[PDB]
Amino acid sequence: GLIYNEFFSVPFEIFSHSAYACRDLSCSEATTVGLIKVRDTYPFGVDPVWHGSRSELPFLNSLKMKMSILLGVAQMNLGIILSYFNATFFRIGVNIWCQFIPQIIFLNSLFGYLSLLIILKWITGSQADLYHVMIYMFLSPTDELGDNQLFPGQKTAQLVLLLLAFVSVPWMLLPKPFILKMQHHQMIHTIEFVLGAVSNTASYLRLWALSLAHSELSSVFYEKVLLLAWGYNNILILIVGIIVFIFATVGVLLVMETLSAFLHALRLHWVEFQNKFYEGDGYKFSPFSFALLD
Amino acid sequence: SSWSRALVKISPYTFSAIGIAVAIGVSVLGAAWGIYITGSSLIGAAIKAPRITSKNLISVIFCEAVAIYGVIVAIILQTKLESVPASQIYAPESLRAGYAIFASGIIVGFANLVCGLCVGIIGSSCALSDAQNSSLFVKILVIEIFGSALGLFGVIVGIIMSAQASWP
Amino acid sequence: AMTFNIHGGYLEAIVRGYRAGLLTIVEKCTLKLVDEYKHMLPLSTFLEYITYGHMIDNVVLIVTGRDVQELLEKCHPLGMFDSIMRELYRLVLVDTPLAPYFSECITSEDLDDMNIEIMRNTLYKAYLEDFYKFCQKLGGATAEIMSDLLAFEADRRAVNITINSIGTELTRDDRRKLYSLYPYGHEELAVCEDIDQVRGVMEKYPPYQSIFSKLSYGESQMLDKAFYEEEVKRLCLAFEQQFHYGVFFAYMRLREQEIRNLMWISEC
Amino acid sequence: ETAPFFGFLGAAAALVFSCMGAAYGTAKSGVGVASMGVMRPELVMKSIVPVVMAGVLGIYGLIIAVIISTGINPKAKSYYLFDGYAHLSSGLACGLAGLSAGMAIGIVGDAGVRANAQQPKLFVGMILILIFAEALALYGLIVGIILSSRAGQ
Amino acid sequence: TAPFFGFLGAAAALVFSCMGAAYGTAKSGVGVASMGVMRPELVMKSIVPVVMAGVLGIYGLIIAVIISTGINPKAKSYYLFDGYAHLSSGLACGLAGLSAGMAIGIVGDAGVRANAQQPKLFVGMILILIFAEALALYGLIVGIILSSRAGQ
Amino acid sequence: ETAPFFGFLGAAAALVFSCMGAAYGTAKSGVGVASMGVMRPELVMKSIVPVVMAGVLGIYGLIIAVIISTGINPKAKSYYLFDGYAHLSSGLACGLAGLSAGMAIGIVGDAGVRANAQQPKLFVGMILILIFAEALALYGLIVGIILSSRAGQSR
Amino acid sequence: ETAPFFGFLGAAAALVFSCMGAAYGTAKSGVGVASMGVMRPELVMKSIVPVVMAGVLGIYGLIIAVIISTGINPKAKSYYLFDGYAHLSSGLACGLAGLSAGMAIGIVGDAGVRANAQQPKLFVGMILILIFAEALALYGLIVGIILSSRAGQSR
Amino acid sequence: ETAPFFGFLGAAAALVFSCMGAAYGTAKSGVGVASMGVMRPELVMKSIVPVVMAGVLGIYGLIIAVIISTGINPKAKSYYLFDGYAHLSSGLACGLAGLSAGMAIGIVGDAGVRANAQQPKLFVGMILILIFAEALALYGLIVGIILSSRAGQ
Amino acid sequence: ETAPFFGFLGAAAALVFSCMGAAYGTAKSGVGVASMGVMRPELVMKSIVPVVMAGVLGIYGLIIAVIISTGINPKAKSYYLFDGYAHLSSGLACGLAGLSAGMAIGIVGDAGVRANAQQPKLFVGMILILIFAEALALYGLIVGIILSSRAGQSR
Amino acid sequence: ETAPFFGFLGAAAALVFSCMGAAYGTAKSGVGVASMGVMRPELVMKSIVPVVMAGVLGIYGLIIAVIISTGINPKAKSYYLFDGYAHLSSGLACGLAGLSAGMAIGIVGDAGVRANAQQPKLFVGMILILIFAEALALYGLIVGIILSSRAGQSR
Amino acid sequence: ETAPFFGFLGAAAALVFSCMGAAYGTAKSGVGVASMGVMRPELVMKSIVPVVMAGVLGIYGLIIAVIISTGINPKAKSYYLFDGYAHLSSGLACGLAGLSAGMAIGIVGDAGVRANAQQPKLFVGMILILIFAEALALYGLIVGIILSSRAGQSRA
């Protein structure tokens, strides 16, 4: 919440004074060509002006979507990396190099183009991309075109990544049965992994959706409370509005939102992070340590 | 546009007459349905025992009251008719009168149907209850009388709407 | 809702009045009730199923022979109607709901219907078929009562099997294969070999919980009496008989229970 | 222009609805009488007349249709839509009332056929119920006559 | 011209309200007769739920009365907005009353049976029915607010 | 223009559908409560919570209808077709969401009340289910409020 | 002129259909949980997974509806019929996907709640089936996002 | 001018119908899988084959929707009706094929769950039946792609 | 003018009807083979013939639809409404014939699975019935091909 | 003119309806024949006569469709609205007659399978019903051909 | 000039509805014949009367359709408005009469075939009932023949 620069459905004083200042506009409207000119970026959190502005929804939605994509990429990378550590700890066979390496490389490379494009747009400020033209660049499977491409090597980089992804598909299916035959079940991993990677990548957007929903509900509650406090500033009306706001915060903000967030977080952790580890089975060893008596 | 113009150009006298007739028709249908519903239970009770014929007849009378009210409303609507002059066949007053007549007729018919169905169900239950025990007949009759007020309310609403007729 | 007034209202009122009036003497009362039921002749299918209920037992009794001529003495029209030994069984396979299924299920005739125990097994199979047929005619609140009755019969058969009929090949598999929540969760009674085990199995259904109680009475009897006696005790629920619903089966059951009580009275 | 067509359609509906209602009531009463005949045949004719009483509704519908037919003539006056629509409405109202009364009377007679056999003392009650039902048909006929009266503009 | 819709609103408001009122009263009445067969005293007091259902008709009747009074053509020019508003106001009141009565009929029918079984739960049934009946009052509030928008 | 003929229709439809959903929920809730309290009158008071939870949808629909009604004022500004269309869309969305939430809450509450006397844990399980269901109604109300607010610009 | 009507209707339809699907799923899951938890307290919390799994679809639908509502801005760009058609298509796709996912999730959750009293080894399989079904909601959200992104590029 | 109002609708309908068919299949597949796992937890993991294959229809529908969305490029070329109508028809065909395949796969999986529970020796036959059913979905996707490819007037 | 609408609609209808018929036939065949997969797995392998026949019928329908689509080349020759109407009629006929043949073959296979399970001697009769059913699909495909060829005769 | 918009559609519908009727009849006959063969494999080969006889509907429909397709030729002579309307009417009559004949033959064969399985004496005699159905189909085809012969009567 | 479309549609409808009635009758007739089989195989030949009646109904429908089609002579006597509406009405009447007669004949024939086993001497009475029912088919054919030219050739 401190990072989000939102406190109890209300902004506050950031570590800086004001990130964005209305370009001129001593009397002009906010919606203008000059719009708002930013002196410097607020380091503690998001710009305070952005939260209450009309343009709050698009910028916040784009930022949340990018953050969700990056977090999902990081979690998938960590889960895939844990496979090599698990194989070494259990001293697993050559199947790690046979299957874990292509499995951790194919999805990583496939999401790498999108992650790098997001970073470059954030880094280079390639406004000719925004949230949409990034997907547009990712949309085209064919070669050529690339007019909107921002990466200097994107024309060849996209083709190289596509070739690597295409070649990685058999490399994740053949070597384990080959080693099994040489040393003399892959159907479970077959087909399932390809669709599951896309499913896990998509599921990361659940966090962004939940964050947006929580922000919207908090904004609605704060707006209701402010409307009660401003026009109905009468003592009885103000007290009733405060009680209603407290009840709403207890119900939706406190209970429902937290429960939904916890359930979604657990679902994400099991679906993707646990998908590349754990592997199930086993049992909990327990001695007769007076457990019933304890 | 052209279809909309044709729809707006329909004769209001036809709609008013249709509503006037439909009010009486729906009232008669609802009264008949309620009468049949009450009569089935009354005949069953009489087969069980002919002692409660006088008590049972109240339900039939209440059901027929709906038909009587519908007939009165139909007579009022017929009185509300006019000569329908050719010059004012599409005048705003004529259209308003026709729309009001149609609305009043539809309201009266629907209210009469609902009241008749409710009265028939109540009487069908009440006859069986009286056959079970004659002591409960008073409460059942009171409930039926209270439920019969739907037709009276609908008739009142229709009569109030009937004052809107202003056909030249 | 309006269909009741559209048709069947007079018959429903007559049945309600007859039931409200209800409360060799036992034989005379049974004959009077049977005459009242017959004189009453959609609801036709319900009446046919209700009659077939006892007609299954009547046909099972008539299937003997072996002093078969004595079946005419108990020719009560309520259950022993003439319209409802494989050669004669094929002829009797008509005009009954459970008969066509029993023709294949009991194709062994007396071999699968031995008078010691297998005749009871054939009767239970016929009762299960009749209960399934009655439950097929869904659309009213009587489905719950029919399910309760079938569950009581199945549970009583299972209890009898576990008590002493286990030695008569009525094993856990036979608790549902031959012994007629029960249509979905009857597997819990396959291991209830003890009265305490029976109570534990009954604990799976909180409504069925505490119904067994000490199990000194009701469950003490074999065949279909163990959980059927629970239904007899709980028949006060059937005494509700909310209006504008099929209550012909309820009235028939109440008349049968009254006849049974009168018979149990006998010489005080 | 189309007013004669509207009036003819209304008369046709007035005839057809009443005929259908009377037919349904008579069929129900006949089924009831056939059922009751096997029990107490001495009473088969004791309720046959209220069973065929649907002829009253049939005759009322025929009378309404004849009245509607009589009122339509180009020679008397070039009646406009205000007359044809009124005639159609009167005919439809009369036909609907007749059909409803016929259905109600058929149900009541189906009940009474068994009721009288079960209790001969209930014949007077059944007759009273039938008269109460036919009161609706009488009211419908009166309303139809009143409506058709004003149609001669 | 447009006033046809406005007139239709008042008729629809009463018709749809009475349609649900009769359905609620029928279900409530049937249960009362069933309880009155055995429990003589309980049935007399249980008639309140039927009386509660019958009140919904009165609420619809008043709403219809207001709509009729506001359709005076010779008084003020009933523009299309007034006709549209009156029809919309009636539609909400009629639909809400139909639903509100339907719940009362379903609840009331079970309540009669429940009271006949255990008299203690009579208070609980009344509380649930009273809470359900508030929806008709809620519909009445919306009808008044919508009808009040006939200023221009 | 003709925009009010759609805006007021949507506003009325919101309340109508919300009331229908609330009634559908309340009927099932009351049936289940009566069934439970027939045998265990003690838990009748605890079983009444889903009834109020369903009834809250009626209040939400009434608030949405009041907002929609206050959002139309020809004397203030010319309500173009866009404003009326957006108001009608908001009303329809809020009403449909309320009706669906009411039906779901009624089914869940009836089931829980039927299972209430079987185990006291139902007192928590049914409450949690009702809260999860009412979350959908709250989300629908928020969406309707957002749409109604966005309806105010109309260029 | 009439395009904003289509866009607002599409957003409202998306929200309403998503709410209806989530409500159906939640009602099915609640009925299943009420049936299962009477016997054992395990279903009270260990099997409350579908209760939130179904509301996730409603949250996604609400997010899509909010995005669509924010998409329309007449003061910033005079939307042609292209924008309205695209918004309506995106809303319809999102709502239909939400309804389908809600129905499937409700059926699967009811089956899992019924099977909860059986061998607990099937919990992993039930969770996997629920996740595979819920993948449809994510697919629909992705399709709606793509349509909304392509919506504003009208000439 | 009105071509996008058909093309976008066709794409949305394709996605919606594919999702509906996938859900219809997955409901029966999951019911059967839960029943088998309750009966025999050993093969529960290996019985998710129809459940997993159900999502292939949704993936194909999403791909077709993406292709249709990429088809509508007003800046690249003025979208005449000849392209929008073709895109809408391709989307409708793909969606209907997906729905039919989903229903067939649901029925096949519902049968095969019980078939494998009784005897796992029929797993090969169940897989072959599922593949034959999914061949229809593959053919529908191919036909939709071919139809969408003809947007050049 | 608007002929491409008719042609595309006809092709889509052909594909949809063929897919629906094939799906119904395959579902019936699988329902039938479910019993044979346990009663006699040895004969179950030979029981996959009706599924193959249904797939063949679907393939024929798809081929006809593909031919119809390939017949539409606006840049080569202007498509008059006559050609579009003819193509739409051909597609509708092919789709209806395929759907009917698929349903008939599915019912036949569902019966024949049990028929062969009871007695292996009925395999010849089942094969003959399947061939007779597939003859109808062949005739429908031939008629569709003839109509597609005739569709280009306009001027 | 817009002649093929109705003529070609009717030509397609003739074959479509004939195929549907033949499929229904063949499915019923095949189910009956499978049941009979399960009862007795000896009669399976001899009982295929109704199945074969039901196939004449497909041949008649294909012939009618080919004739109708050949009857449309704008290059040879322009066809007015009447020229297409007559062909469409002939096709519709032929298709409806074929469907009715197929349904009747299917019912008759379904009965006759059991009739022959029970009493072999009546097996050959029962073919009279099938002969009558085939005669009805032939009469319908003749009527359709007579109607279609008026293609060149226009002027 | 659009009347010939209606006329051809009416002739086609006549043929189609006559065929539908014949099929509906023949289905019940064959069901009854099969039911009477084995129980009394001797009376198999005597049970073919409903089949003959259905064939007669189909032949009458075909004859009416051919008679209507014989009026399709656009080379002379310009159709005008009558030649379409009259032909369509006649075809519809003939087809509906054929369908009703076929349904009645099927019902009566099935009932008789089922009842042929009990009191086999009642075959004459069953045939009499069947003929009294099938007389409606002849009445409909006569009505169609009357309407075939009454309002068709008198357009002048």
Cβ of G138 and A203 within 8 Å? yes
- Alpha-helix runs per DSSP H in chain H: 3-39, 49-71, 81-118, 123-148
Contact present, J93 and J65 (Cβ < 8 Å): no
Using the structure block, give the residue that is written with the tokens 């309520």: C78
Chain A residues in contact with G60 by the CB 8 A cut-off are: 206, 209
In whole angstroms, give the CA distance from residue F121 to residue F139.
Answer: 28
DSSP state at residue A93: -
| Cα A137 to chain centroid, rounded | 20
Chains B and I touch (3+ CB pairs under 8 A): no
CA distance K63 to chain J (A): 9
Chain C residues in contact with D114 by the CB 8 A cut-off are: 10
User: Which tokens belong to K54?
Assistant: 């259905």
Q: Across the C/D interface, how many CB contacts are shorter than 8 Å?
A: 8
What number of other Cβ atoms are within 10 A of residue C66's Cβ?
Answer: 10
Chain H CB within 8 Å of residue G89 CB: yes
Using the structure block, give the residue that is written with the tokens 């008299």: E119
Cβ of C1 and E34 within 8 Å? no
> Which helix (H) or strand (E) is A37 found in, with range?
strand A36-38
What number of other Cβ atoms are within 10 A of residue C116's Cβ?
Answer: 7
CA distance B102 to chain D (A): 12
Cβ of H133 and I8 within 8 Å? no
In whole angstroms, give the CA distance from residue I45 to residue E42.
Answer: 70
Cβ of B39 and D143 within 8 Å? no
In whole angstroms, give the CA distance from residue A118 to residue A115.
Answer: 5
In whole angstroms, give the CA distance from residue J77 to residue J152.
Answer: 9
User: Which tokens belong to G153?
Assistant: 């590029």
In whole angstroms, give the CA distance from residue J23 to residue J30.
Answer: 10
Chain C residues in contact with E26 by the CB 8 A cut-off are: 1
Can you spell out the DSSP letters for I28-55?
Answer: HHHHHHHHHHHH-HHHHGGGGHHHHHHH
Out of H19, H33, H66, whose CB is closest to G129?
H33
Contact present, C175 and C181 (Cβ < 8 Å): no
Cβ of A271 and G131 within 8 Å? yes
3-class DSSP state of K83: helix
Chain K residues in contact with J79 by the CB 8 A cut-off are: none
3-class DSSP state of E92: helix
Using the structure block, give the residue that is written with the tokens 């299920």: C105
DSSP state at residue J13: H
3-class DSSP state of B63: helix
Judge residue J76's burial from the number of C-beta atoms within 10 Å of its C-beta, 0-12 exposed, 13-18 middle, 19 or more buried. Answer: exposed
Can you spell out the DSSP letters for A181-207?
Answer: HHH--HHHHTTHHHHHHHHHHHHTHHH
Name all chains with 3 or more CB-CB pairs below 8 Å to chain B.
C, D, E
J26-39 burial by CB neighbour count: b if 16+ within 10 A, else e? Answer: bbbbbbbbbbbbbb
In whole angstroms, give the CA distance from residue I92 to residue I12.
Answer: 9
H40-53 burial by CB neighbour count: b if 16+ within 10 A, else e? Answer: bbebbbebbbbbbb
Nearest CA in chain D to C5: D107
User: Which tokens belong to B159?
Assistant: 């009569």
Residue E30, amino acid:
V
CA distance E8 to chain B (A): 5
Chain I CB within 8 Å of residue J65 CB: yes
Chains A and F touch (3+ CB pairs under 8 A): yes
Instruction: Please choose, from the candidates A261, A223, A279, A249, the residue with its C-alpha nearest in 3D space to the C-alpha of residue A83.
Output: A279
| CA distances to E90, F98, G14, G98, J41 from F89, in Å | 20, 14, 11, 18, 67
Instruction: Please choose, from the candidates J31, J37, J29, J35, the residue with its C-alpha nearest in 3D space to the C-alpha of residue K30.
Output: J29
Residues 6 or more apart in contact with residue K131 via CB below 8 angstroms? none
Cβ of E127 and F8 within 8 Å? no
Contact present, J122 and K40 (Cβ < 8 Å): no
Chain J CB within 8 Å of residue I107 CB: yes
Chain D residues in contact with C9 by the CB 8 A cut-off are: 111
Instruction: Please choose, from the candidates C47, C17, C16, the residue with its C-alpha nearest in 3D space to the C-alpha of residue C34.
Output: C47
Nearest CA in chain B to C243: B125
Chain H CB within 8 Å of residue A3 CB: no
In whole angstroms, give the CA distance from residue F14 to residue F22.
Answer: 12
User: Which tokens belong to E99?
Assistant: 């639903």
Contact present, I16 and H93 (Cβ < 8 Å): yes
Name all chains with 3 or more CB-CB pairs below 8 Å to chain E.
B, C, F
Instruction: Please choose, from the candidates C171, G7, C188, C207, the residue with its C-alpha nearest in 3D space to the C-alpha of residue F117.
Output: C207
In whole angstroms, give the CA distance from residue F59 to residue I111.
Answer: 58
Return the C-alpha torsion angle A267, A272, A274, A277, nearest 10. 180
Contact present, K57 and K22 (Cβ < 8 Å): yes
Chains G and B touch (3+ CB pairs under 8 A): no
I68-95 burial by CB neighbour count: b if 16+ within 10 A, else e? Answer: bbebbeeeeeebebbbbbbbbbbbbbbb
In whole angstroms, give the CA distance from residue B101 to residue B76.
Answer: 11
In whole angstroms, give the CA distance from residue C169 to residue C51.
Answer: 31
CA distance G106 to chain F (A): 11
Can you spell out the DSSP letters for chain C?
Answer: -THHHHSSHHHHHHHHHHHHH---HHHHHHHHHHHHHHHT--HHHHHHHHHHHHHHHHHHHHT----GGGGGGG--TTT--TT--HHHHHHHTSS-SSHHHHHHHTTTGGGTS-TTTHHHHHHHHHHHHHHHHHHHS-SSTHHHHHHHHHHHHHHHHHHHHHHTGGGGT--TTHHHHT---HHHHGGGGGG--SHHHHHHHHTTSTTTTTTSTT-SSSTTS-SS-TTHHHHHHHTTTTT---SSS--HHHHHHHHHHHHHHHHHHS--
Cβ of A192 and H66 within 8 Å? no
Can you spell out the DSSP letters for C135-169?
Answer: HHS-SSTHHHHHHHHHHHHHHHHHHHHHHTGGGGT
Instruction: Please choose, from the candidates A247, G31, E129, G55, the residue with its C-alpha nearest in 3D space to the C-alpha of residue F126.
Output: G31
User: Which tokens belong to B65?
Assistant: 């009251």
Residues 6 or more apart in contact with residue A108 via CB below 8 angstroms? A76, A77, A80
DSSP state at residue A36: E
Chains K and J touch (3+ CB pairs under 8 A): yes
Can you spell out the DSSP letters for K119-135?
Answer: SGGGHHHHHHHHHHHHH
Chain G CB within 8 Å of residue F28 CB: no
Cβ of K15 and J93 within 8 Å? yes
Using the structure block, give the residue that is written with the tokens 């020679």: D75
Cβ of E34 and C243 within 8 Å? yes
In whole angstroms, give the CA distance from residue E107 to residue F55.
Answer: 14
Give, to the nearest 10 degrees, the angle between helix G123-151 and helix H49-71. Answer: 0
Nearest CA in chain B to E54: B147
Instruction: Return the CA Rg of chain C.
Output: 19
Q: For chain B, give the longest Cα–Cα distance.
A: 68
In whole angstroms, give the CA distance from residue J51 to residue D80.
Answer: 65
Give the mutation candidate from F5, F78, F136 for the G interface (greatest G CB count, under 10 A).
F136
User: Which tokens belong to C160?
Assistant: 């009898």
In whole angstroms, give the CA distance from residue C58 to residue A219.
Answer: 75
DSSP state at residue K152: T
Cβ of B47 and C17 within 8 Å? yes
Using the structure block, give the residue that is written with the tokens 């892959």: A186
In whole angstroms, give the CA distance from residue G55 to residue G44.
Answer: 17
- Which method was it determined by? cryo-EM
Using the structure block, give the residue that is written with the tokens 């255990």: E118
Out of H45, H46, H70, whose CB is closest to A139?
H70
Name all chains with 3 or more CB-CB pairs below 8 Å to chain K.
J
Contact present, D91 and D143 (Cβ < 8 Å): no
In whole angstroms, give the CA distance from residue I108 to residue D112.
Answer: 54
Residue C63 dihedral angles phi and psi, to the nearest 5°: -65, -15
D113-144 burial by CB neighbour count: b if 16+ within 10 A, else e? Answer: bbbbbbbeebbebbeebbebbbbbbbbbbebb
User: Which tokens belong to K125?
Assistant: 């009475």
In whole angstroms, give the CA distance from residue B82 to residue B13.
Answer: 9
User: Which tokens belong to G152?
Assistant: 């504003």
Chain I residues in contact with H104 by the CB 8 A cut-off are: 22-24, 26-27, 30
Residues 6 or more apart in contact with residue B166 via CB below 8 angstroms? B93, B96, B97, E73, E74
Instruction: Please choose, from the candidates D86, D85, D24, D98, the residue with its C-alpha nearest in 3D space to the C-alpha of residue D56.
Output: D98
In whole angstroms, give the CA distance from residue H98 to residue B47.
Answer: 63
CA distance H25 to chain G (A): 9
Cβ of A191 and H52 within 8 Å? yes
User: Which tokens belong to D35?
Assistant: 């059922």
CB-facing half-sphere around the CA of C151: CA atoms within 13 A: 20
Instruction: Return the CA Rg of chain J.
Output: 19
The 3-state secondary structure of chain F, one letter per residue: CCHHHHHHHHHHHHHHHHHHHHHHHHHHHHHHHHHHHHHCHHHHCHHHHHHHHHHHHHHHHHHHHHHHHHCCCCCCCCCCHHHHHHHHHHHHHHHHHHHHHHHHHHHHHHHHHHCCCCCCCHHHHHHHHHHHHHHHHHHHHHHHHHHHHHCCCCC
In whole angstroms, give the CA distance from residue C192 to residue C202.
Answer: 9
Chain K residues in contact with J114 by the CB 8 A cut-off are: 34
Out of J13, J23, J45, whose CB is closest to I104?
J23
Cβ of C243 and E26 within 8 Å? no
Residue C193 dihedral angles phi and psi, to the nearest 5°: -80, -10
Measured CB to CB, residues of chain C less than 8 Å from chain B are 1-2, 4-5, 9-10, 12-14, 16-17, 20, 243-244
Chain G residues in contact with H106 by the CB 8 A cut-off are: none
Residue I132, amino acid:
F
Instruction: Please choose, from the candidates K147, K140, K127, the residue with its C-alpha nearest in 3D space to the C-alpha of residue K101.
Output: K140
How far apart are the two ends of chain J, measured CA to CA in Å? 14
CA distance D142 to chain C (A): 27
> Which helix (H) or strand (E) is D85 found in, with range?
helix D81-118
Instruction: Please choose, from the candidates J114, J107, J100, J97, the residue with its C-alpha nearest in 3D space to the C-alpha of residue J130.
Output: J107
